[PDB]
Amino acid sequence: TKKKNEEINKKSLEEDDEFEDFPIDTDDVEVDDDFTNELKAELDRYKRENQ
Amino acid sequence: TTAAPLLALLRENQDSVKTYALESINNVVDQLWSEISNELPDIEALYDDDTFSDREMAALIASKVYYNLGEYESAVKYALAAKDRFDIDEKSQFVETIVSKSIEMYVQEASKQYTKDEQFYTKDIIDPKLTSIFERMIEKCLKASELKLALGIALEGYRLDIIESALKSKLDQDSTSENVKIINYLLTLAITTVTNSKFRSSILRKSFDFLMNMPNCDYLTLNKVVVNLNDAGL
Amino acid sequence: LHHSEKKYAEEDQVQELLKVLNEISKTTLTLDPRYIWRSLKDLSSLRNQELLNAETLCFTVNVLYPDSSSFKKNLLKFITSNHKSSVPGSAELRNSYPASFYSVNTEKKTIEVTAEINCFMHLLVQLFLWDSKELEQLVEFNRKVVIPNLLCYYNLRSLNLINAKLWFYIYLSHETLARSSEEINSDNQNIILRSTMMKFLKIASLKHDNETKAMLINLILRDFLNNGEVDSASDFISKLEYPHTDVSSSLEARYFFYLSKINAIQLDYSTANEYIIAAIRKAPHNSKSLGFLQQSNKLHCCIQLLMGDIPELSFFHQSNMQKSLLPYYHLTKAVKLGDLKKFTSTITKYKQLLLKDDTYQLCVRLRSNVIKTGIRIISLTYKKISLRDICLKLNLDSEQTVEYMVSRAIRDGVIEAKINHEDGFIETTELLNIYDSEDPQQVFDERIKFANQLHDEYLVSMRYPEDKKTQQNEK
Amino acid sequence: LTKSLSIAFENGDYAACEKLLPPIKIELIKNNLLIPDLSIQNDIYLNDLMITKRILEVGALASIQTFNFDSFENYFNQLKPYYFSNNHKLSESDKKSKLISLYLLNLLSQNNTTKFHSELQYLDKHIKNLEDDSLLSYPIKLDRWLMEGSYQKAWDLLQSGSQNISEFDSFTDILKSAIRDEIAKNTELSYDFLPLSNIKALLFFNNEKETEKFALERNWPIVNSKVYFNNQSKEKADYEDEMMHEEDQKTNIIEKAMDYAISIEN
C-alpha cells in the first residue's frame, strides 16, 4: 500500500496517458570514415609523386 | 489575480484612495498573504504614525498577514494594537485562534507574577487590554452556562478573582444538596493538579469560608479542609 | 442477474466498512486505519470492473443518508434514471445493531455515527466518477456538496487522514472540466478553486497534520505553474513549513518535480540539479509509473544542457522511452558537437512536441550554449588559434563578434583563455591540474557527509522491527 | 470627467495629463464600483469597463514620457489583471501589444533579468502566440542577443529604435549605459592593455574624451593612452572578500576534521 500511494498521486501529472499520448503523436555516430580516408591518402599521394 | 495594484495605491498621498485600498486588501489576504508580505513594512509605517486616520484598519491587516504566515507573536501584538476591530474577530469562529494565542501568553505571565502578589491584573506591566481578552474567552463558556469550562481555564492562569465570583453566583443556595456538591469537586481538582503551596492553600481556604458562612452545612466536607491545610485556626 | 451481483458487492463493502469502523474508534492507532484506507481504495478501484459497480448505489441504500441521498439521485439523473431499489432506507436490515449503525440513535441526534462514513462514502463516489468519466454536472455537483460538507464538520486527527485524499479529487476534477472544453466559467472557477484549498491549509497548520499539508502544497504549486506566475510562486515557497518527516515519498517526488521546474525557468540551474536527480530516484519504476518517468527525463536533459553538462548518451542509449525522447536527444547532440546550423533546424522541426511539455522555452536558451561548447572545443584542441580562423569556421559576422563570444564566455570561466588583440590570436591559459589546489578537500566534504547520514538512518531503523516480533509469542 | 483626460493626450501635453490625474484618482474609486468587479459580466458592463481601461492607459503612457517610474509601475500592476481577464473581453487592442513591449524593456533597464523571464513565461502562452512578435520581437531579441554573447547584434537594435520612438527612448538611454559596462567587464579579464582606438570601438563610443570619462569613474589608470584593468579591481576584490557572511561558509581544515570525528562518536 506504500506503493499504491505512489502510483495514484502521480497520475494527475500523467493524465490520460503521458505514456502513449507521445508515441501516438509521432565513436558510434561518425559515418564510414574509411572511405573518406582512402580518397584523402590517394589525393595526397598523386601530388607528392608528380612533384 | 494579484494584490500589487492595491499595494501601489497606498503610496499616493491622497487619504481617500489609501483607505479604499485597505478595504480591498482585507478581502484578498486569504491567498495573497504572500505577495503582500514583500510590501508589508509600508502598511506598518502608516499605522505607526498618528498622522494616518484609518490606523485601526492598517494594524488589523498587518496582523492577518502575520497570522497566515504563522508568525503568531506579531499577529497577537497587532490585534491588540488596533484595540478595536475585535467584533470582526469574534464574528469569525475560525479565528478564535489568536484569542487562544493570547490565552497562552497570559497564563505564563500571570502564573509567574502571582507569587509576588496575588494581584497583578491591574498592574501596569500586565497590559490591561490582554487582561480583558482572557476574561472574554471565559465569558463565552458562561453564555452557554457551563461553569466547568469557565473554572478550568481560570485555574491554569492563576486567577483567584474569577473563581470567587463564579462560585458565588451559583452559591445562591438552591439547596444544601447542590452547595455541598460544588465544594467537593473543587477539592479533588485542586489537590492533584496544583501542588504549589501558595496557590493551592488559597483555593482551599475559600472553600472553607463558603460552607462556614452558611449556618447549616455537612461536617464531612469540613473535616477534610481542616486536616489538609493542617491549620488549627480554622 | 442484477440481484446476485448487486448483493455480493454490498456484502464486500460492508465487510470493509466494519473493519475500519472497529479500528478508528480505539485510541491513537492512526497508522492502521491509514494503511488500511489506502489498500482499500486500490481494492475498490480494482473491484468495479467485474461484478458491477452499482456498489455505490447499494452502499448508499444501506447507510444513514445525511446528503448522500441527494447526490445519488443526481448521479442517477445524469445517466438516465431508473428505480428498482434506489432510495436509502428501502431495506431495513441495520435493525438497531451497533455495527450497521444504531438506527434510532442516529435519528435522535444524541450521537453522530454518520460523520467519518460520509467522508469515506465521498472518496468512494469521487473514485468511481473519475474511473467512469462522469464529467460536467456530477463533477460540479460533487465539488459544491463536499467543500461546505467538510467546513460543516470539525477536524480530528482521524478526519485529517481522510481529507488527505478528498482534496486531490476536488482539484483534479476541475482540471478535467478545463480539459474538456473552454468555458468563460472555467476562468472564474479557477480562482475559487485556489481559494478553498488555501483556507483549509491555514487551519491544517493548526491541526499539525503533515499529511494534509504536503498534499495541499503540491496541488497549489501545480496551478501557479499553468499560469506561469513565477513571482507569486517565489514568495509562496518562502513560507517554509512544507513537512517531509511524516509524509509519503510520492508527495516528496511531486514537490521536487515542481521545484526543479520553477528554479530552472527563473535562471537558476545549480540547485535545480539536486532536485531533479532526487525526484527521479524517489519515483518508483512501476509500469503505470512509466509515463511520469519520461517527463522527468525530458526536463533533466534540459537542466543539464543549460548548466553546461552533457547528459551521458549511454543513459539514453539503453532507454526504451525512445520515440518520445527523440527531440531531446538531438538537442543534446547539437550542444555536444557545437554545430551551429544543426541547432536551429532541430528546434524548428520539433516545435509542437516540445511546446506541449513546455520544455521549449528552455530549449531557445540553449542557443547561447551551442556556441560556447563549440569554442570549448577549439580551445582544447589549439593553444594559439588566430581569431581570423575562428571567424570563418563558426561563420561569425565580423572580427569584433568573435572577440565578444570569447570575452563573455570567460566571465563564467568555462573556456579560461586570454585574448591578444594586437598579436591577433588566443593563447590558452587553462590550469588543467587542480590536485595542487585546495579544491580536492571541498569535493570530498560532500562525499563524506552523505555517507555519515546513511549510517544514522540505519541505526534508528534496525531496532524497531526486532521489538515487535520479540513481544509477540514465539519460540 | 473621462473625456477631459481623453483629449489631454491628443493635445499632446503629457504635463497636462500629469496635473489632471490626481482628481481622477478619487474618481477611479467610482469607476470601480460601476463594475461589480467581475462577479458577473454583462454587455452594459463591457462598456463600463472600456472607459476604465482607457483612463488608466492614457495615464500610463504619460508617466513614461515624464520619466516618473513609480506611477507607471503602479498603474501597470493594476493593468495586468485588468488585461488578463477571462479568455478575451475587449482586452485585445493595438495598445495591448504596445504596453507589453514597454513593460519588458523596463524590466531589462532595471537590470533585473530574474523578473524579466518571469514576466516572459506569463506571456509565452496565448497572447505571444496569437499576436506573433512584431513589437514583442524588439524585447525578445534584445534580451536574447545579450544572453548569446553577440554584443554587436544587441547594439544594432538599440540604434535602429529611432523609427519607432514615442516613449521607448526613456528606456533606450538607461539600457545603453549598462551595455557598455557589460562589455567592459567581459573585456576586463580578456586583456589588460588595449590600443586607444580599440577601447573606443568596442564600447562603441563616438568620442575619445567620453572613453576617459568612463575610466575615471571606473577607477582605472590611463597610461600612455592605454587602459590598465589589473590593479584596483584585484585590491577591491580582496577587500570585498572579507565580510561577516562568508566566514562560516569557508570551512577550516581543522573544523572539517572535528566534524568527521564526532559524527562517528555520537
PDB file of C-alpha atoms in Angstrom, chain B residues 18-207:
ATOM      1  CA  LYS B  18      -5.438  54.725   0.584  1.00  0.00           C
ATOM      2  CA  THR B  19      -8.404  53.926   2.707  1.00  0.00           C
ATOM      3  CA  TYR B  20     -10.381  52.377  -0.093  1.00  0.00           C
ATOM      4  CA  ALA B  21      -7.235  50.186  -0.803  1.00  0.00           C
ATOM      5  CA  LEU B  22      -7.197  48.824   2.820  1.00  0.00           C
ATOM      6  CA  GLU B  23     -10.665  47.581   2.468  1.00  0.00           C
ATOM      7  CA  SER B  24      -9.737  45.838  -0.786  1.00  0.00           C
ATOM      8  CA  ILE B  25      -6.650  44.175   0.839  1.00  0.00           C
ATOM      9  CA  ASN B  26      -8.640  42.862   3.735  1.00  0.00           C
ATOM     10  CA  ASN B  27     -10.674  40.613   1.260  1.00  0.00           C
ATOM     11  CA  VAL B  28      -7.697  39.076  -0.662  1.00  0.00           C
ATOM     12  CA  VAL B  29      -5.283  38.310   2.208  1.00  0.00           C
ATOM     13  CA  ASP B  30      -6.682  34.755   2.315  1.00  0.00           C
ATOM     14  CA  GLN B  31      -4.423  33.845  -0.676  1.00  0.00           C
ATOM     15  CA  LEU B  32      -2.315  36.837  -1.380  1.00  0.00           C
ATOM     16  CA  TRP B  33      -0.823  36.611   2.066  1.00  0.00           C
ATOM     17  CA  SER B  34       2.344  36.045   0.143  1.00  0.00           C
ATOM     18  CA  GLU B  35       2.856  38.912  -2.396  1.00  0.00           C
ATOM     19  CA  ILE B  36       1.743  41.383   0.288  1.00  0.00           C
ATOM     20  CA  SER B  37       4.393  40.362   2.663  1.00  0.00           C
ATOM     21  CA  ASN B  38       7.168  41.883   0.495  1.00  0.00           C
ATOM     22  CA  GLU B  39       5.474  45.236   0.975  1.00  0.00           C
ATOM     23  CA  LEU B  40       4.185  44.786   4.420  1.00  0.00           C
ATOM     24  CA  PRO B  41       6.611  47.494   6.075  1.00  0.00           C
ATOM     25  CA  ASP B  42       4.634  50.265   4.215  1.00  0.00           C
ATOM     26  CA  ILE B  43       1.378  49.069   5.837  1.00  0.00           C
ATOM     27  CA  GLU B  44       3.178  49.136   9.239  1.00  0.00           C
ATOM     28  CA  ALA B  45       4.580  52.743   8.843  1.00  0.00           C
ATOM     29  CA  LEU B  46       1.003  54.049   8.018  1.00  0.00           C
ATOM     30  CA  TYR B  47      -0.235  52.648  11.399  1.00  0.00           C
ATOM     31  CA  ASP B  48       2.776  53.681  13.489  1.00  0.00           C
ATOM     32  CA  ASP B  49       2.156  57.337  12.614  1.00  0.00           C
ATOM     33  CA  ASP B  50      -0.720  59.071  14.324  1.00  0.00           C
ATOM     34  CA  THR B  51      -0.880  61.122  11.005  1.00  0.00           C
ATOM     35  CA  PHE B  52      -2.929  58.372   9.486  1.00  0.00           C
ATOM     36  CA  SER B  53      -6.687  58.242  10.414  1.00  0.00           C
ATOM     37  CA  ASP B  54      -7.648  54.768   9.383  1.00  0.00           C
ATOM     38  CA  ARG B  55      -4.988  53.340  11.795  1.00  0.00           C
ATOM     39  CA  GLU B  56      -7.016  50.516  13.348  1.00  0.00           C
ATOM     40  CA  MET B  57      -7.726  49.082   9.929  1.00  0.00           C
ATOM     41  CA  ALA B  58      -3.999  49.155   8.895  1.00  0.00           C
ATOM     42  CA  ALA B  59      -2.845  47.174  12.070  1.00  0.00           C
ATOM     43  CA  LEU B  60      -5.720  44.715  11.504  1.00  0.00           C
ATOM     44  CA  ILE B  61      -4.445  43.877   8.050  1.00  0.00           C
ATOM     45  CA  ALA B  62      -0.775  43.520   9.183  1.00  0.00           C
ATOM     46  CA  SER B  63      -1.997  41.002  11.840  1.00  0.00           C
ATOM     47  CA  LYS B  64      -3.841  38.921   9.283  1.00  0.00           C
ATOM     48  CA  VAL B  65      -0.624  38.778   7.249  1.00  0.00           C
ATOM     49  CA  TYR B  66       1.379  37.527  10.267  1.00  0.00           C
ATOM     50  CA  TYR B  67      -1.355  35.032  11.227  1.00  0.00           C
ATOM     51  CA  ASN B  68      -1.388  33.221   7.816  1.00  0.00           C
ATOM     52  CA  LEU B  69       2.378  33.070   7.780  1.00  0.00           C
ATOM     53  CA  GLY B  70       2.056  31.707  11.176  1.00  0.00           C
ATOM     54  CA  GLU B  71       4.385  34.208  12.933  1.00  0.00           C
ATOM     55  CA  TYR B  72       1.870  34.251  15.816  1.00  0.00           C
ATOM     56  CA  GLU B  73       3.632  36.575  18.218  1.00  0.00           C
ATOM     57  CA  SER B  74       3.300  39.695  15.963  1.00  0.00           C
ATOM     58  CA  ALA B  75      -0.172  38.735  14.955  1.00  0.00           C
ATOM     59  CA  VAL B  76      -1.376  38.975  18.562  1.00  0.00           C
ATOM     60  CA  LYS B  77       0.521  42.256  19.336  1.00  0.00           C
ATOM     61  CA  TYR B  78      -1.047  43.912  16.163  1.00  0.00           C
ATOM     62  CA  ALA B  79      -4.653  42.686  17.140  1.00  0.00           C
ATOM     63  CA  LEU B  80      -4.199  44.320  20.493  1.00  0.00           C
ATOM     64  CA  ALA B  81      -2.552  47.305  18.866  1.00  0.00           C
ATOM     65  CA  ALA B  82      -5.618  48.202  16.665  1.00  0.00           C
ATOM     66  CA  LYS B  83      -7.625  47.981  20.033  1.00  0.00           C
ATOM     67  CA  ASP B  84     -10.837  47.986  18.152  1.00  0.00           C
ATOM     68  CA  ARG B  85     -11.735  45.816  15.148  1.00  0.00           C
ATOM     69  CA  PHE B  86     -12.260  42.998  17.617  1.00  0.00           C
ATOM     70  CA  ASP B  87     -16.000  42.428  16.749  1.00  0.00           C
ATOM     71  CA  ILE B  88     -14.630  41.303  13.398  1.00  0.00           C
ATOM     72  CA  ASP B  89     -12.518  38.639  15.142  1.00  0.00           C
ATOM     73  CA  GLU B  90     -15.496  37.445  17.134  1.00  0.00           C
ATOM     74  CA  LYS B  91     -17.720  37.015  14.099  1.00  0.00           C
ATOM     75  CA  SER B  92     -15.148  34.605  12.756  1.00  0.00           C
ATOM     76  CA  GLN B  93     -15.227  31.269  14.669  1.00  0.00           C
ATOM     77  CA  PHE B  94     -12.284  30.151  12.515  1.00  0.00           C
ATOM     78  CA  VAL B  95     -10.151  32.869  14.053  1.00  0.00           C
ATOM     79  CA  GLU B  96     -10.654  32.190  17.634  1.00  0.00           C
ATOM     80  CA  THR B  97      -7.053  31.109  17.009  1.00  0.00           C
ATOM     81  CA  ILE B  98      -5.403  34.316  18.040  1.00  0.00           C
ATOM     82  CA  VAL B  99      -7.606  34.646  21.040  1.00  0.00           C
ATOM     83  CA  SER B 100      -6.253  31.337  22.303  1.00  0.00           C
ATOM     84  CA  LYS B 101      -2.694  32.500  21.465  1.00  0.00           C
ATOM     85  CA  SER B 102      -3.463  35.448  23.746  1.00  0.00           C
ATOM     86  CA  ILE B 103      -4.583  32.907  26.440  1.00  0.00           C
ATOM     87  CA  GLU B 104      -1.249  31.155  26.094  1.00  0.00           C
ATOM     88  CA  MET B 105       0.746  34.323  26.554  1.00  0.00           C
ATOM     89  CA  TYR B 106      -1.392  35.330  29.554  1.00  0.00           C
ATOM     90  CA  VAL B 107      -1.254  32.167  31.521  1.00  0.00           C
ATOM     91  CA  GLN B 108       2.571  32.116  31.623  1.00  0.00           C
ATOM     92  CA  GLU B 109       2.877  35.713  32.776  1.00  0.00           C
ATOM     93  CA  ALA B 110       0.138  35.607  35.394  1.00  0.00           C
ATOM     94  CA  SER B 111       1.294  32.497  36.967  1.00  0.00           C
ATOM     95  CA  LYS B 112       4.805  33.999  37.448  1.00  0.00           C
ATOM     96  CA  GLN B 113       3.630  37.173  38.934  1.00  0.00           C
ATOM     97  CA  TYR B 114       1.121  35.571  41.215  1.00  0.00           C
ATOM     98  CA  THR B 115       3.679  34.582  43.811  1.00  0.00           C
ATOM     99  CA  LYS B 116       4.961  38.091  44.388  1.00  0.00           C
ATOM    100  CA  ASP B 117       1.470  39.403  44.913  1.00  0.00           C
ATOM    101  CA  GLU B 118      -1.784  37.607  44.060  1.00  0.00           C
ATOM    102  CA  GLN B 119      -2.905  40.677  42.245  1.00  0.00           C
ATOM    103  CA  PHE B 120      -1.182  41.839  39.042  1.00  0.00           C
ATOM    104  CA  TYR B 121      -4.142  42.154  36.577  1.00  0.00           C
ATOM    105  CA  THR B 122      -4.427  45.899  37.023  1.00  0.00           C
ATOM    106  CA  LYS B 123      -0.614  46.167  37.110  1.00  0.00           C
ATOM    107  CA  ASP B 124       0.943  48.327  34.524  1.00  0.00           C
ATOM    108  CA  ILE B 125       3.357  45.595  33.476  1.00  0.00           C
ATOM    109  CA  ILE B 126       0.416  43.303  32.543  1.00  0.00           C
ATOM    110  CA  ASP B 127      -1.135  45.214  29.722  1.00  0.00           C
ATOM    111  CA  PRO B 128      -4.900  45.841  30.626  1.00  0.00           C
ATOM    112  CA  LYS B 129      -6.127  45.002  27.099  1.00  0.00           C
ATOM    113  CA  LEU B 130      -4.623  41.468  27.285  1.00  0.00           C
ATOM    114  CA  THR B 131      -6.281  41.071  30.757  1.00  0.00           C
ATOM    115  CA  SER B 132      -9.731  41.586  29.288  1.00  0.00           C
ATOM    116  CA  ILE B 133      -9.304  39.134  26.293  1.00  0.00           C
ATOM    117  CA  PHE B 134      -8.599  36.444  28.859  1.00  0.00           C
ATOM    118  CA  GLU B 135     -11.971  37.105  30.636  1.00  0.00           C
ATOM    119  CA  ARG B 136     -13.817  37.255  27.234  1.00  0.00           C
ATOM    120  CA  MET B 137     -12.913  33.727  26.230  1.00  0.00           C
ATOM    121  CA  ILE B 138     -14.229  32.608  29.649  1.00  0.00           C
ATOM    122  CA  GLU B 139     -17.333  34.726  29.235  1.00  0.00           C
ATOM    123  CA  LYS B 140     -18.271  32.693  26.057  1.00  0.00           C
ATOM    124  CA  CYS B 141     -18.400  29.451  28.142  1.00  0.00           C
ATOM    125  CA  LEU B 142     -20.555  31.303  30.717  1.00  0.00           C
ATOM    126  CA  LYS B 143     -23.106  32.397  27.959  1.00  0.00           C
ATOM    127  CA  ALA B 144     -23.507  28.681  27.310  1.00  0.00           C
ATOM    128  CA  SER B 145     -23.939  28.174  31.095  1.00  0.00           C
ATOM    129  CA  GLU B 146     -21.388  25.535  31.886  1.00  0.00           C
ATOM    130  CA  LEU B 147     -19.265  26.591  34.932  1.00  0.00           C
ATOM    131  CA  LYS B 148     -16.649  23.741  34.306  1.00  0.00           C
ATOM    132  CA  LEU B 149     -15.140  25.099  31.099  1.00  0.00           C
ATOM    133  CA  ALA B 150     -15.054  28.562  32.860  1.00  0.00           C
ATOM    134  CA  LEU B 151     -13.177  27.470  36.070  1.00  0.00           C
ATOM    135  CA  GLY B 152     -10.973  25.251  34.124  1.00  0.00           C
ATOM    136  CA  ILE B 153      -9.438  27.989  32.133  1.00  0.00           C
ATOM    137  CA  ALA B 154      -9.073  30.352  35.138  1.00  0.00           C
ATOM    138  CA  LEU B 155      -7.221  27.720  37.243  1.00  0.00           C
ATOM    139  CA  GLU B 156      -4.207  27.352  34.845  1.00  0.00           C
ATOM    140  CA  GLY B 157      -3.852  31.011  34.618  1.00  0.00           C
ATOM    141  CA  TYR B 158      -3.732  31.552  38.468  1.00  0.00           C
ATOM    142  CA  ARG B 159      -6.869  33.769  38.633  1.00  0.00           C
ATOM    143  CA  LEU B 160      -8.394  33.934  42.046  1.00  0.00           C
ATOM    144  CA  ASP B 161     -10.950  36.809  41.486  1.00  0.00           C
ATOM    145  CA  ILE B 162     -12.650  34.978  38.749  1.00  0.00           C
ATOM    146  CA  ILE B 163     -13.005  31.694  40.777  1.00  0.00           C
ATOM    147  CA  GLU B 164     -14.525  33.533  43.665  1.00  0.00           C
ATOM    148  CA  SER B 165     -17.127  35.270  41.568  1.00  0.00           C
ATOM    149  CA  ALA B 166     -18.088  32.193  39.517  1.00  0.00           C
ATOM    150  CA  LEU B 167     -18.667  30.057  42.567  1.00  0.00           C
ATOM    151  CA  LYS B 168     -20.642  32.654  44.436  1.00  0.00           C
ATOM    152  CA  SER B 169     -23.252  33.274  41.682  1.00  0.00           C
ATOM    153  CA  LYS B 170     -24.121  29.519  41.931  1.00  0.00           C
ATOM    154  CA  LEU B 171     -23.872  29.600  45.768  1.00  0.00           C
ATOM    155  CA  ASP B 172     -27.368  31.190  45.835  1.00  0.00           C
ATOM    156  CA  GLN B 173     -28.490  28.265  47.825  1.00  0.00           C
ATOM    157  CA  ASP B 174     -30.973  26.479  45.540  1.00  0.00           C
ATOM    158  CA  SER B 175     -30.423  23.688  48.075  1.00  0.00           C
ATOM    159  CA  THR B 176     -27.928  22.206  50.650  1.00  0.00           C
ATOM    160  CA  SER B 177     -27.646  19.224  48.394  1.00  0.00           C
ATOM    161  CA  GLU B 178     -26.242  21.185  45.468  1.00  0.00           C
ATOM    162  CA  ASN B 179     -23.953  23.561  47.536  1.00  0.00           C
ATOM    163  CA  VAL B 180     -22.360  20.528  49.017  1.00  0.00           C
ATOM    164  CA  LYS B 181     -21.517  19.087  45.633  1.00  0.00           C
ATOM    165  CA  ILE B 182     -19.855  22.132  44.209  1.00  0.00           C
ATOM    166  CA  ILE B 183     -17.446  22.377  47.017  1.00  0.00           C
ATOM    167  CA  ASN B 184     -16.330  18.772  46.900  1.00  0.00           C
ATOM    168  CA  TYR B 185     -15.340  18.708  43.165  1.00  0.00           C
ATOM    169  CA  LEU B 186     -13.237  21.783  43.725  1.00  0.00           C
ATOM    170  CA  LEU B 187     -11.211  19.965  46.455  1.00  0.00           C
ATOM    171  CA  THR B 188     -10.309  16.941  44.353  1.00  0.00           C
ATOM    172  CA  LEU B 189      -9.247  19.046  41.376  1.00  0.00           C
ATOM    173  CA  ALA B 190      -7.188  21.498  43.363  1.00  0.00           C
ATOM    174  CA  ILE B 191      -5.283  18.763  45.159  1.00  0.00           C
ATOM    175  CA  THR B 192      -3.926  16.669  42.330  1.00  0.00           C
ATOM    176  CA  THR B 193      -3.089  19.371  39.736  1.00  0.00           C
ATOM    177  CA  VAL B 194      -1.892  22.265  41.707  1.00  0.00           C
ATOM    178  CA  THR B 195       0.813  21.234  44.060  1.00  0.00           C
ATOM    179  CA  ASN B 196       2.303  24.691  44.564  1.00  0.00           C
ATOM    180  CA  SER B 197       1.751  25.659  48.160  1.00  0.00           C
ATOM    181  CA  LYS B 198       0.542  29.171  47.916  1.00  0.00           C
ATOM    182  CA  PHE B 199      -1.992  28.694  45.112  1.00  0.00           C
ATOM    183  CA  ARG B 200      -3.471  25.517  46.487  1.00  0.00           C
ATOM    184  CA  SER B 201      -3.727  26.897  50.008  1.00  0.00           C
ATOM    185  CA  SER B 202      -5.725  29.896  48.698  1.00  0.00           C
ATOM    186  CA  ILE B 203      -8.336  27.799  46.890  1.00  0.00           C
ATOM    187  CA  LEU B 204      -8.961  25.567  49.878  1.00  0.00           C
ATOM    188  CA  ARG B 205      -9.263  28.477  52.238  1.00  0.00           C
ATOM    189  CA  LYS B 206     -12.104  29.958  50.150  1.00  0.00           C
ATOM    190  CA  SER B 207     -13.888  26.629  50.079  1.00  0.00           C
TER     191      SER B 207
END
